[PDB]
Amino acid sequence: SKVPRNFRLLEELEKGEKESCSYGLADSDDITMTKWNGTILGPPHSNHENRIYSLSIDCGPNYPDSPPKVTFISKINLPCVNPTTGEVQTDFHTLRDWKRAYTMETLLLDLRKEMATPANKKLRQPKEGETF
Amino acid sequence: AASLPKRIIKETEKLVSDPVPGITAEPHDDNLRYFQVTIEGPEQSPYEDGIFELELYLPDDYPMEAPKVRFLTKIYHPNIDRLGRICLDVLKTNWSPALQIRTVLLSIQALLASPNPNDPLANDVAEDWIKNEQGAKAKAREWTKLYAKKKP
């Protein structure tokens, strides 16, 4: 019943190959499927509206039992994202309470949701196009 | 659900007691549905110098659902992609409970001996195999030496 890392990642890849978020491999021939690129479209009714954020996701040897490492490439002003490195902090709930059933889709969706909390939605954002 | 289906147990035993020539397949002690598989490159094919490593997993609905398999060894072939995904009819819509793991392994072995760049489902490597078959085969042979395990 436990799907091995490699086949769980093949499952997510297929799902990613076929509307607010997307992801795919950073290297099309990376057989270990470790590094992924992700994108999140900023939520409506916020300072993130119409913005598109690029991210890097690293699914290590123990994924999905262990959560992946997520780093924003696109600059963003969001409390759970380290403002110098772009790294999503370990305390973010999805990472903190990571379950094997969780996927990269779960994480991207949860981050998009975070962009829309009343306190986060009013934060001023960097000029369009800036990177960490 | 406190035990593996008898069919998996029996297929696993038979893969050991009656192995397919050129093929090895054994489950991981910590996951009896996850298999390490090796297939020798067919004699007289561009892959003849090496042994290829694959991984196979039997999903919870097997045998209603097809086994999942893929190559771990990097390979240049028109029906196996850059991530090792295998385009084989019996691993897709044409899988049925009447087939078994052995069927699949034999089919992959045959696919190495007979690449089919003209299949509507072939990958992006197909164009090279159609326009410059001699160069495509030379690259497949070169990659076998660079990436596959060596035969004795």
From Swiss-Prot, chain A:
<feature type="domain" description="UBC core">
    <location>
        <begin position="4"/>
        <end position="132"/>
    </location>
</feature>
<dbReference type="GO" id="GO:0000209">
    <property type="term" value="P:protein polyubiquitination"/>
</dbReference>
<dbReference type="GO" id="GO:0070534">
    <property type="term" value="P:protein K63-linked ubiquitination"/>
</dbReference>
<dbReference type="InterPro" id="IPR016135">
    <property type="entry name" value="UBQ-conjugating_enzyme/RWD"/>
</dbReference>
<dbReference type="GO" id="GO:0016874">
    <property type="term" value="F:ligase activity"/>
</dbReference>
<dbReference type="GO" id="GO:0010994">
    <property type="term" value="P:free ubiquitin chain polymerization"/>
</dbReference>
<protein>
    <recommendedName>
        <fullName>Ubiquitin-conjugating enzyme variant MMS2</fullName>
    </recommendedName>
</protein>
<comment type="subunit">
    <text>Heterodimer with UBC13.</text>
</comment>
<dbReference type="GO" id="GO:0005634">
    <property type="term" value="C:nucleus"/>
</dbReference>
<comment type="function">
    <text>Has a role in the DNA error-free postreplication repair (PRR) pathway. Lacks catalytic activity by itself. The UBC13/MMS2 heterodimer catalyzes the synthesis of non-canonical poly-ubiquitin chains that are linked through 'Lys-63'.</text>
</comment>
<dbReference type="InterPro" id="IPR000608">
    <property type="entry name" value="UBQ-conjugat_E2_core"/>
</dbReference>
<dbReference type="Pfam" id="PF00179">
    <property type="entry name" value="UQ_con"/>
</dbReference>
<keyword id="KW-0597">Phosphoprotein</keyword>
<dbReference type="GO" id="GO:0005829">
    <property type="term" value="C:cytosol"/>
</dbReference>
<dbReference type="GO" id="GO:0000329">
    <property type="term" value="C:fungal-type vacuole membrane"/>
</dbReference>
<keyword id="KW-0436">Ligase</keyword>
<keyword id="KW-0833">Ubl conjugation pathway</keyword>
<dbReference type="GO" id="GO:0005737">
    <property type="term" value="C:cytoplasm"/>
</dbReference>
<feature type="modified residue" description="Phosphoserine">
    <location>
        <position position="66"/>
    </location>
</feature>
<dbReference type="GO" id="GO:0031371">
    <property type="term" value="C:ubiquitin conjugating enzyme complex"/>
</dbReference>
<dbReference type="GO" id="GO:0006301">
    <property type="term" value="P:postreplication repair"/>
</dbReference>
<comment type="similarity">
    <text>Belongs to the ubiquitin-conjugating enzyme family.</text>
</comment>
From Swiss-Prot, chain B:
<keyword id="KW-1017">Isopeptide bond</keyword>
<dbReference type="GO" id="GO:0044395">
    <property type="term" value="P:protein targeting to vacuolar membrane"/>
</dbReference>
<keyword id="KW-0808">Transferase</keyword>
<dbReference type="GO" id="GO:0000329">
    <property type="term" value="C:fungal-type vacuole membrane"/>
</dbReference>
<dbReference type="GO" id="GO:0005829">
    <property type="term" value="C:cytosol"/>
</dbReference>
<dbReference type="GO" id="GO:0031371">
    <property type="term" value="C:ubiquitin conjugating enzyme complex"/>
</dbReference>
<feature type="cross-link" description="Glycyl lysine isopeptide (Lys-Gly) (interchain with G-Cter in ubiquitin)">
    <location>
        <position position="92"/>
    </location>
</feature>
<dbReference type="InterPro" id="IPR000608">
    <property type="entry name" value="UBQ-conjugat_E2_core"/>
</dbReference>
<comment type="similarity">
    <text>Belongs to the ubiquitin-conjugating enzyme family.</text>
</comment>
<dbReference type="Pfam" id="PF00179">
    <property type="entry name" value="UQ_con"/>
</dbReference>
<comment type="pathway">
    <text>Protein modification; protein ubiquitination.</text>
</comment>
<keyword id="KW-0833">Ubl conjugation pathway</keyword>
<dbReference type="GO" id="GO:0005634">
    <property type="term" value="C:nucleus"/>
</dbReference>
<comment type="function">
    <text>Has a role in the DNA error-free postreplication repair (PRR) pathway. The UBC13/MMS2 heterodimer catalyzes the synthesis of non-canonical poly-ubiquitin chains that are linked through 'Lys-63'.</text>
</comment>
<dbReference type="GO" id="GO:0006301">
    <property type="term" value="P:postreplication repair"/>
</dbReference>
<feature type="active site" description="Glycyl thioester intermediate">
    <location>
        <position position="87"/>
    </location>
</feature>
<comment type="subunit">
    <text>Heterodimer with MMS2.</text>
</comment>
<dbReference type="InterPro" id="IPR016135">
    <property type="entry name" value="UBQ-conjugating_enzyme/RWD"/>
</dbReference>
<feature type="domain" description="UBC core">
    <location>
        <begin position="3"/>
        <end position="149"/>
    </location>
</feature>
<dbReference type="InterPro" id="IPR023313">
    <property type="entry name" value="UBQ-conjugating_AS"/>
</dbReference>
<dbReference type="GO" id="GO:0010994">
    <property type="term" value="P:free ubiquitin chain polymerization"/>
</dbReference>
<protein>
    <recommendedName>
        <fullName>Ubiquitin-conjugating enzyme E2 13</fullName>
        <ecNumber>2.3.2.23</ecNumber>
    </recommendedName>
</protein>
